[PDB]
Amino acid sequence: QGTQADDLVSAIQQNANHFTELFCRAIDNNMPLPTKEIDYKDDVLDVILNQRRLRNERMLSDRTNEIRSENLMDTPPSSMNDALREVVEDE
């Protein structure tokens, strides 16, 4: 097509240890939602990771609710939602 793309193959051939984690992060960025519902026949690791993910979402929701309930400035909804997302994410 003519566009410029870097030589990813040689970079993987010379730095496979870094590109393992790079690929894992890229995969974790866009992970499709599970169509199948979790049940009692799944592995213990799967239910542990599912509980960890649900705990992560509950922590994020609780922190967002707490900071929104504080209402520091009493004041652009997209800007305040973005800033609230960043402060919840790094807090």
Q: Give the footprint of another protein on this chain (CB under 8 A).
A: 40-41, 43-45, 47-48, 51, 55, 59, 70, 72
**Cβ neighbour number for residue 67 with a 10 Å cutoff:** 15
Query: Which has the closest alpha carbon to 87: 51, 29, 68?
Result: 68
Two structure tokens written together for 11: 């970079």
Nearest distance in Å: CB 23, another protein: 19
DSSP 42: S
For another protein, give the closer residue by CB, 7 or 40: 40
Nearer to another protein, 6 or 67 (CB): 67
> Measured from the CB of residue 41, what is the shortest distance to another protein in angstroms?
6
* Among 38, 41, 45, 90, CA closest to 63: 90
Beta carbon of residue 53, minimum distance to another protein (angstroms, whole number) = 12
**Do the Cβ atoms of 84 and 60 come closer than 8 Å?**
no
CB of 47 to another protein, least distance (A): 5
Nearer to another protein, 5 or 44 (CB): 44
